[PDB]
RNA sequence: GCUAAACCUAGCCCCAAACCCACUCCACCUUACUACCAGACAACCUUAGCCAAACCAUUUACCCAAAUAAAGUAUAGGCGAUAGAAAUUGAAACCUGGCGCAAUAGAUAUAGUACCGCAAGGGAAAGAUGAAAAAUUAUAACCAAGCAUAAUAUAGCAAGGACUAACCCCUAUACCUUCUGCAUAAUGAAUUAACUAGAAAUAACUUUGCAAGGAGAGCCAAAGCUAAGACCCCCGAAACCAGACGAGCUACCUAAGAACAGCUAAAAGAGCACACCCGUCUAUGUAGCAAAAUAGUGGGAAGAUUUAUAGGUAGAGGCGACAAACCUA
RNA sequence: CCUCCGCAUAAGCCUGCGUCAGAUUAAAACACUGAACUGACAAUUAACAGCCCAAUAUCUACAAUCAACCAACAAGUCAUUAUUACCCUCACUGUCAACCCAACACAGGCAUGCUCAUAAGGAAAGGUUAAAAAAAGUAAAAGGAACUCGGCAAAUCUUACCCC
């Protein structure tokens, strides 16, 4: 390609324009409604016991009579606490091994230098 | 453009985005990394463009200028001083033209020299009370300004000529924004004359 | 626009109008034989026929007659070093045709290699290399193998 | 690695976290009380020390509870301190035979009661011990209001208790006007309790129901920042003008 | 065995699966009882392209443009730039009323006008 | 039973310094000579002091 | 000298401290990686089993409240292999490492990647020059198992005694083990490199220290008490329970379809016979084309026949025109 | 020379003998260069089958087998009415191939239509000599089961008796 930098320049220019218009929209929404993130939702717990942010899909009929939305469960049920504890222990082991690696690197740096 | 580098990639003079770099260490070999001095960004006094001096080596006590700096392994090169010998053009029946190539050096082997007396002198970072941050000497108390080096854009602004697809300057700095309580969509709709009579009914969100 | 949640249209609602679109079409030269009226493009995976017609008649203002698109599946067989398949990004090519019977060909952006400006940081090295090649290539088989440096 | 807190303190940690920490003090105390119930399926020992035969030496004795099971039919109705006992029974009352498993079931009598505080009849599959406790407590309302949460072992009992407490606290007209003397006599008969309104609403609720109620009370739609901005602006202009 | 690591496209299922999968295309209508498509003209995204006749602005900026500091455009700056002068003007004379604020651009609800911000009725 | 041969290299020096870089080469000489000196034809005959 | 041998770093295990996290836009409960439509039913339950008592039917620490002495005391226990407290003096806040290792070790990990089954799941080796590879230089070579350089020369468990010289002269039945007796024609072995197999109490022995007292609370004592040293293997089965998975091959059932030339067609769960369903025999191979094949001689082929699609019946069972046949070789 | 094959539909990962450079090394059971390859170029555009049906009440016993004689039994594969509301319209999934399941480029297996051999498609043989042995094919002066436990491949074309 003769000049590939022009493509990246146009890309970052359009990204900056998108960021500017999004910031303007957010400022106008805060000055009018006063709530961040135009996509509504709430913190709901799924079956896997993970605290995720469920996004609304915007339906026509309400939720108390829908057939497909009622099949979407939102409860942990006492059988995922063990899996959550095991995941927490695994992440704790990961963090401890990372801290041990950092300490070993610091010791090597202090020993050689 | 944006390629993810390995966590233990060896920097060997050549930039990561080159054919020789991909030929040297392809993403398949994980050789022993080289531990370097953990130098911060505020203590890095030597730049690219200022004159330096080789401490020891095959030609100690000589002066020279730096043309490229490396912050990953603290590698600096001198403008045709501590160099060796190699060959550029090499074929299967004829090769020659010996062109010397520079060799990188460490920060412990390079000291900054003041242009007043041309002598090696340790330079510290003394924050001036005027506002800016420059380099002040230690045993001499002298100031060494930042060397003027061309940026990586490869173009100087003292002779730039605006092209066909390049705008001027009196239009990019023209105050045309009017702060109001109107969205961009409705504004560009009412500015072009687009009207709408019907409204939007009630909708749920779940 | 792509990757944007579309508003739910109600029976009798306003017209769905988009201002800042997020579509990137690519004019690709046809590989096989094609007539003079059929033009081949490349639209993203989130674009239909009427959307392409409006995009071509609103910006470029090109009279479009018919649009026939299809999905192209990229290759997936190239293996890396750790024995893993490499997935190629897919795309959707288009085949639009003009309306007023106009003709359109694909010019070349390349036959113009007449450039020889002043080169000091690139052409000088090549000039030195070719001069050395012309001055060194002077072997003599009658010598046998003795160097041609000693004048004695 | 090792944990900082034991595995039996995570419930207390979650209660002391954030959303579960905004609960009132009385509700948290009633939840963390944890008191042993009354012996039903076993006779408790008299004194803490019992003189056993064969050897003239005193030894300390203790009364251990019986792990009983509570089916949802117990939570729906009003049962006593009994339930399902999933234990084991030998053959001919001897340990030198076969160890079989036997599960006892209480007796259910579908009767009909009449609450004086609520003035409404309910059909509850009552047993025998519950009827005995009602007869000893001189009515159903007294049996419901005197027995604590560890004695009903049912959700309907706690709901009835909370309803009676709210009716006695709010002083809401139970029956109807034209005869306030009956309502006055009913309120005077049940005057040895009178739990305040701010504490009677959190009696018998579970953890999930309490969290839901606290979230509904602490809902509050986000107020637009325009009002706060104009308030700060008018305050600043008044401060810069009056000086 | 069959593949597992690859995603589920539209070239894997039999005759009963080609159709309901798709490639994420946005529907602009529905179907009827005669195997026909009822396309609604109010569901297709209409591209609004303004006129580009007298527009003197190139997509590339010249290198002679001076740089400046970068700062986000928060809501407080827009408020103090738009509504603050009008409020100060109407209060300095003696006619401001904290009961009505609909004359400054504030809307108590979003169900009155068309382009709502919190539910976002406009596409992009 | 699935191994191949590695080590893929070439023995030829191509161009790579000036391909998208900001560091040139500081030479110390040139290609050939500036102007070729033409000695006199009677140099061997007049190899004395002067004539 | 070819084959090929070593070059340390991703880090790996446990301590002390600290409580650790989860939306950039879109998609994720139906055929997850799918924008858009009318019955809201879905958790609340003694775990079991192996082993031991030389069997085994009672029994067998595992129960999640900090040490110790009491104390392995009273007790429970086919009163036996074992289990086991309580009452009681009491329990000094804060400091950043390895008398552990370096790719057959240490997490399996560069990774839960390839590969196997529809499925749960199982699951392995990787990377070595250099300050300057923008130094493609000339060197640093030298050691195991396999080879040429440099084949054999009569005789003999490959060995010893020897002489001026390999053979020629004499003697001499490989290695560990269940076994009285093994090279026996019993068991194991092609080599090299890495790895792999004696962990511990009461009572005993020796040597310091103190002493009718010893011992850093508790215990012992008619020469005792404290401390130290010294000591007791590895691998290899059929069986049982608990939590999840399978009728896409095969057994049965259900709903909608398809298949069967021609002749004799006696009206037919008729005959010969294409395609088709199964395979009685010969010959070929058993590391083959194939972890069940090749041609005919074979029975049926208008019906108790075969088949494309979708669903259901699964182990204390499913199914069964009953072979203890089948339930992914 | 074979065609006991091929072309489409049904099921199936989806780019798997088109071009270019490398073809020094690497996979062809050896070579050319290519069905056991590295990177770049783009194929397939629907009309084919799907993506389906606004409700309230009500209606549907005289098969198919040329369906016209006759004849049945296993008693059977197809249909509407009254009312209310609705005149915006052509979007989406694939159209390549020498291909699937068996660890494979396997003498194994796969549902329907088309001429049941043709207009589809491929090569039992690398060369040299004719060792022994083995396997697959034609027949033989006289006997035609006298060899073998038994008619065990084979071709003639084959009757009667007994048990179940
Ligand atoms: Mg035993
Ligand atoms: Mg105690
Ligand atoms: Mg390892
Ligand atoms: Mg391993
Ligand atoms: Mg050797
Ligand atoms: Mg001898
Ligand atoms: Mg041994
Ligand atoms: Mg043995
Ligand atoms: Mg023996
Ligand atoms: Mg032997
Ligand atoms: Mg033996
Ligand atoms: Mg052997
Ligand atoms: Mg089946
Ligand atoms: Mg059967
Ligand atoms: Mg028949
Ligand atoms: Mg037949
Ligand atoms: Mg039988
Ligand atoms: Mg086709
Ligand atoms: Mg096979
Ligand atoms: Mg042909
Ligand atoms: Mg051949
Ligand atoms: Mg041959
Ligand atoms: Mg004969
Ligand atoms: Mg005979
Ligand atoms: Mg025969």
Contact C127 F31 (CB under 8 A): yes
C-alpha–C-alpha distance, residues A87 and C9, integer Å: 43
* CA torsion through residues A88, A93, A96, A102, sign: negative
Residue written as tokens 């009914």? B201
Coil, strand or helix: which one is C92? strand
Strands B135-137 and E29-31, bridge-based pairing: unpaired
Contact A58 B184 (CB under 8 A): no
Cβ under 8 Å to C: A residues 14-73: 21, 39, 58-60
C-alpha–C-alpha distance, residues F51 and F49, integer Å: 7
Identify which of B203, A32, D186, D133 has the alpha carbon closest to the alpha carbon of residue E106.
A32
Q: Which tokens belong to B67?
A: 């043309």
Nearest CB among E76, E88, E98 relative to D229 is that of: E76
C-alpha–C-alpha distance, residues D32 and D24, integer Å: 13
Which value, to the nearest 10 degrees, does the dihedral of the CA atoms of residues D39, D45, D46, D49 take?
-150
C-alpha–C-alpha distance, residues D167 and D155, integer Å: 18
Distance of CA E109 to the CA centre of its chain: 19
Domain boundaries, given as residue ranges, for chain D: 1-243
Is residue B51 within 8 A of residue B64, CB to CB? The reply is yes
C-alpha–C-alpha distance, residues D132 and D116, integer Å: 19
Residue written as tokens 């309302």? D141
CATH architecture of C1-152: 2-Layer Sandwich (3.30)
Instruction: Return phi, psi of residue E53, to 5°.
Output: -85, -75
Identify which of C100, C6, C19 has the alpha carbon closest to the alpha carbon of residue C55.
C19
Distance of CA F13 to the CA centre of its chain: 14
Residues 6+ apart with CB under 8 A from B160: E62, E63, E64
Residues 6+ apart with CB under 8 A from F26: B67, B79, B80, B102
Residue of F nearest to B101 (CA): F25
State whether residue D229 sits within 8 Å of chain E by CB: yes
Nearest CB among B79, B89, B90 relative to F26 is that of: B79
C-alpha–C-alpha distance, residues C4 and C9, integer Å: 15
Which value, to the nearest 10 degrees, does the dihedral of the CA atoms of residues E8, E11, E14, E18 take?
90
Contact E42 C85 (CB under 8 A): no
C-alpha–C-alpha distance, residues B6 and A98, integer Å: 18
A89 CA from centroid of ligand 3 (Å): 23
End-to-end CA distance of chain E: 45
Residue to mutate among A29, A58, A64, A68, with most B CBs inside 10 A, is A58
Please list every residue in chain C whose beta carbon sits closer than 8 Å to the beta carbon of residue F18.
Answer: 121-122, 125
Contact positions of strand G to protein Cβ (< 7 A): 8-23, 25-40, 42-46, 57-59, 64-65, 74-75, 77-78, 85-87, 96-98, 107, 110, 113-114, 116-119, 126-136
Please list every residue in chain E whose beta carbon sits closer than 8 Å to the beta carbon of residue C53.
Answer: none
C-alpha–C-alpha distance, residues D195 and D156, integer Å: 19
Instruction: Return phi, psi of residue B114, to 5°.
Output: -85, 140
Give the determination technique. Answer: cryo-EM
Identify which of C29, C93, C24 has the alpha carbon closest to the alpha carbon of residue C59.
C24
* CA torsion through residues B189, B191, B196, B197, sign: positive
Please tell me the total number of residues recorded for chain B in this structure.
206
**Measured between alpha carbons, how far is residue C18 from residues A56, B107, C41, E114, E124 in Å?**
22, 57, 22, 15, 6
C-alpha–C-alpha distance, residues E68 and E63, integer Å: 14
| Exposed / middle / buried, residue D215 (Cβ in 10 Å: 0-12, 13-18, 19+) | exposed
Q: Which tokens belong to D96?
A: 């030198």
Q: Which tokens belong to B86?
A: 């190699």
C-alpha–C-alpha distance, residues F40 and F50, integer Å: 13
Q: Which nucleotide is nearest to B83 (CA to C1')?
A: G132
Q: Which tokens belong to D95?
A: 């340990």
Identify which of F28, C27, C145, A69 has the alpha carbon closest to the alpha carbon of residue B80.
F28
C-alpha–C-alpha distance, residues E24 and D98, integer Å: 67
C-alpha–C-alpha distance, residues E120 and E112, integer Å: 13
Strand partners, E47: C18
Coil, strand or helix: which one is C79? strand
Please tell me the total number of residues recorded for chain A in this structure.
113
Is residue B76 within 8 A of residue B69, CB to CB? The reply is yes
Is residue D138 within 8 A of residue D59, CB to CB? The reply is no
| Exposed / middle / buried, residue E60 (Cβ in 10 Å: 0-12, 13-18, 19+) | middle
Identify which of C38, C34, C141, C14 has the alpha carbon closest to the alpha carbon of residue C98.
C38
Taking only Cα atoms into account, the Rg of chain E, rounded to an integer number of angstroms, comes to: 27
C-alpha–C-alpha distance, residues E79 and D230, integer Å: 9
Q: What's the per-residue H, E or C state across chain B?
A: CCCCCCCCCCCCCCCCCCHHHHHHCCCCCCCCCCCCCCCCCCCCCCCCCCEEEECCCCCCCCEEECCCEECCCCEECCCCCCECCCCCCECCCCECCCCCCECCECCCCEEEEECCCCEECCEECCCCCCCCCCEEECCCCCEECCCCCCCCCCCCCCCCCCCCCECCCCCCCCCCCCCCCCCHHHHHHHHCCCCCCCCCCCCCCC
Across chain A, the runs of DSSP E, i.e. the strands, are: 41-45, 51-55
Residue of C nearest to B93 (CA): C137
What string of DSSP letters covers chain D?
---SS-TTSHHHHHHTSSTTTSS-HHHHHHHH-------SSSPPPSSSEEE-SSS--EEE-------EE--HHHHHS---S--EEEEEEESSS-SSS-EEEEEE----EEEE--BTTTTB--EEEE-SHHHHHHHHTTSHHHHHHHS-HHHH-SHHHHHHHHHHHHHHHH---SS-TT-HHHHHHHHHHT-S----HHHHTTSS--HHHHHHHHHHHT--PPPPHHHHHHHHHHHHHHHHHH-
Identify which of B184, E82, E24 has the alpha carbon closest to the alpha carbon of residue A18.
B184
* CA torsion through residues B3, B4, B10, B11, sign: positive
Is residue C88 within 8 A of residue C76, CB to CB? The reply is yes
Q: Count of CB contacts below 8 A, B vs C? A: 34
Coil, strand or helix: which one is E46? strand
Resolution in A: 3.0
Element holding A89 (H helix, E strand)? helix A81-112
Count Cβ atoms below 10 Å from residue C59 Cβ, excluding itself.
Answer: 13
C-alpha–C-alpha distance, residues D183 and D195, integer Å: 18
Q: Which tokens belong to E72?
A: 């986000």
Cβ under 8 Å to F: C residues 93-132: 121-122, 125, 127-128, 131-132
Q: Which nucleotide is nearest to F10 (CA to C1')?
A: G136
Strand partners, B69: B76
Is residue B65 within 8 A of residue B82, CB to CB? The reply is no
Contact positions of strand H to protein Cβ (< 7 A): 10-16, 25-26, 38-46, 49-54, 88-95, 102
Identify which of C13, C2, E117, E111 has the alpha carbon closest to the alpha carbon of residue A60.
C13
C-alpha–C-alpha distance, residues D160 and D168, integer Å: 12
Identify which of C5, D41, D207 has the alpha carbon closest to the alpha carbon of residue A58.
C5
B and E touch with 3+ CB pairs <8 Å, answer yes
C-alpha–C-alpha distance, residues C6 and E24, integer Å: 12
Residues 6+ apart with CB under 8 A from A93: D1
D2 CA from centroid of ligand 4 (Å): 26
Please list every residue in chain F whose beta carbon sits closer than 8 Å to the beta carbon of residue C131.
Answer: 31-32
Q: Which tokens belong to B187?
A: 């504004």
Residue to mutate among B87, B97, B197, B205, with most C CBs inside 10 A, is B97
Is residue A60 within 8 A of residue C8, CB to CB? The reply is yes
Q: Which nucleotide is nearest to A76 (CA to C1')?
A: G43
What string of DSSP letters covers C26-55?
--PPPSS---SSEEEEEE-SS--HHHHHHH
Is residue C12 within 8 A of residue B201, CB to CB? The reply is yes
Contact E120 C50 (CB under 8 A): no
Element holding C67 (H helix, E strand)? strand C64-67
C-alpha–C-alpha distance, residues C61 and C57, integer Å: 4
Residues 6+ apart with CB under 8 A from E20: none
DSSP letter at C5?
P
Structural domain of B86? 5-148
Element holding E38 (H helix, E strand)? strand E37-39
Write down the number of H helices and E strands in chain F.
Answer: 0, 0
Is residue C52 within 8 A of residue C27, CB to CB? The reply is no
Strands E46-47 and C17-18, bridge-based pairing: parallel
Q: Count of CB contacts below 8 A, A vs B? A: 33
C-alpha–C-alpha distance, residues A101 and A97, integer Å: 6
User: For A93, what's the count of Cα atoms within 13 Å in the CB-facing half-sphere?
Assistant: 6
C-alpha–C-alpha distance, residues C58 and B112, integer Å: 62
Instruction: Return phi, psi of residue D178, to 5°.
Output: 75, -10
């Amino acid at each position: 390609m003769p000049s590939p930098e022009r493509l990246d320049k146009v890309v970052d220019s359009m990204d900056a324009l998108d960021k500017v218009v999004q910031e303007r929209e957010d400022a106008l929404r805060l000055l009018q409604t006063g709530q961040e993130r135009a996509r509504p939702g709430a913190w709901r717990r799924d079956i896997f016991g993970r605290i995720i942010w469920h996004k609304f899909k915007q339906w026509v009929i309400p939720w108390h009579l829908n057939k497909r939305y009622n099949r979407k469960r939102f409860f942990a049920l006492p059988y995922v606490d063990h899996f959550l504890r095991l995941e927490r222990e695994k992440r704790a082991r990961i963090k401890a091994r990372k801290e041990n690696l950092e300490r070993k690197k610091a010791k090597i740096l202090l020993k050689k230098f | 453009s944006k390629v993810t580098l390995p966590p233990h990639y060896r920097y060997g003079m050549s930039p990561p985005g080159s054919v020789a770099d991909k030929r040297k260490n392809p993403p398949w070999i994980r050789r022993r990394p080289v531990v370097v001095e953990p130098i911060s960004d505020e203590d890095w006094y030597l730049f690219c463009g200022d004159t330096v001096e080789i401490l020891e080596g095959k030609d100690a006590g000589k002066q020279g200028k730096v043309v490229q700096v490396i912050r990953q392994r603290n590698w600096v090169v001198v403008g045709g001083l501590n160099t060796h010998y190699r060959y550029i053009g090499k074929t299967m029946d004829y090769r020659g033209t010996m062109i010397p190539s520079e060799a990188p050096l460490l920060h412990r082997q390079v000291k900054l020299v003041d242009p007043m007396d041309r002598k090696p002198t340790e330079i510290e970072w003394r924050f001036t009370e005027a506002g800016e941050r420059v380099r002040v000497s230690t045993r001499s108390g002298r100031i060494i300004p930042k060397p003027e080096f061309p940026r990586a854009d490869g173009i100087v602004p003292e002779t730039w000529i605006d092209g066909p697809k390049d705008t001027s300057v009196e239009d990019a700095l023209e105050r045309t924004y009017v702060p109001c309580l109107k969205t961009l969509q409705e504004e560009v709709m009412e500015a072009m004359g687009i009207k709408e009579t019907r409204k939007y009914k009630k909708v749920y969100w779940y | 626009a792509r990757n944007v949640v579309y508003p739910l249209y109600r029976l009798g609602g306003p017209q769905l109008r988009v201002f800042r679109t997020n579509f990137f079409i690519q004019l690709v030269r046809p590989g096989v034989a094609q007539p003079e009226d059929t033009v081949q493009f490349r639209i993203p995976m989130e674009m239909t026929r009427v959307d392409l017609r409006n995009y071509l008649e609103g910006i470029y203002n090109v009279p479009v007659a018919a649009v026939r698109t299809r999905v192209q599946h990229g290759s997936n067989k190239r293996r890396d070093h750790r024995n893993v398949r490499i997935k190629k990004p897919d795309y959707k090519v288009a085949y639009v045709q003009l309306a007023h019977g106009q003709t359109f060909t694909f010019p070349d952006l390349f036959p113009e290699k007449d450039e020889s400006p002043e080169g000091s940081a690139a052409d000088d090295l090549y000039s030195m290399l070719e001069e050395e090649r012309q001055q060194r290539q002077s072997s003599d088989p009658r010598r046998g193998g003795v160097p041609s440096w000693f004048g004695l | 690695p090792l944990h900082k807190y034991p595995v039996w303190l995570w419930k207390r940690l979650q209660l002391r976290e954030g959303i579960c920490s905004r609960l009132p003090g009385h509700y948290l105390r009633s939840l963390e009380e944890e008191r042993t119930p009354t012996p039903v399926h076993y006779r408790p020992h008299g004194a803490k020390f019992k003189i056993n035969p064969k050897n003239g030496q005193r030894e300390r004795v203790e009364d251990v509870p019986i792990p009983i099971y509570f089916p949802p039919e117990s939570q729906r109705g009003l049962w006593g301190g009994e339930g399902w006992i999933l234990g084991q029974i030998y053959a001919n009352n001897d340990k030198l035979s076969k160890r079989l498993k036997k599960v006892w079931k209480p007796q259910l009598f579908e009767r009909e009661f009449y609450s004086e505080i609520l003035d409404k009849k309910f059909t509850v599959t009552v047993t025998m011990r519950t009827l005995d406790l009602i007869d000893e407590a001189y009515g159903l309302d007294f049996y419901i209001l005197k027995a604590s949460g560890e004695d009903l072992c049912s959700k309907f009992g706690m709901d009835l208790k909370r309803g009676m407490l709210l009716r006695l606290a709010r002083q809401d007209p139970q029956l109807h006007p034209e005869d306030p003397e009956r309502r006055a006599a009913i309120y005077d008969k049940y005057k040895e309790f009178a739990i305040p309104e701010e504490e009677a609403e959190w009696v018998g609720l579970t953890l999930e129901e309490a969290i839901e109620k606290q979230r509904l009370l602490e809902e509050k739609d986000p107020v637009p920042l325009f009002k706060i901005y104009v308030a700060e602006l008018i305050q600043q202009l008044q401060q810069q003008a009056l000086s | 065995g069959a593949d597992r690591m690859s995603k589920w496209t539209s070239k894997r299922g039999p005759r009963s699966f080609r159709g309901r999968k798709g490639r994420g295309a946005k529907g602009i209508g529905f179907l009827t009882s005669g195997w026909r498509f009822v396309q609604i003209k109010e569901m297709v995204p209409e591209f609004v392209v303004p006129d580009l006749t007298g527009f003197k602005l190139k997509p590339y900026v010249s290198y002679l443009a001076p740089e400046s500091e970068e700062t986000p455009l928060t809501a407080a700056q827009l408020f103090s730039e738009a509504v603050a002068p009008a409020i100060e003007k109407d209060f300095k004379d003696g006619t401001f009323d904290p009961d009505n604020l609909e004359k400054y651009g504030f809307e108590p609800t979003q169900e009155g006008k068309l382009f709502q911000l919190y539910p976002r009725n406009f596409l992009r | 039973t699935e191994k191949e041969f590695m080590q893929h290299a070439r023995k030829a020096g191509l161009v790579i310094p000036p391909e998208k870089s900001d560091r040139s080469i500081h030479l110390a000489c040139t290609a050939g000579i500036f102007d070729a000196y033409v000695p006199p034809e009677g140099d061997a005959r007049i190899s004395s002091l002067s004539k």
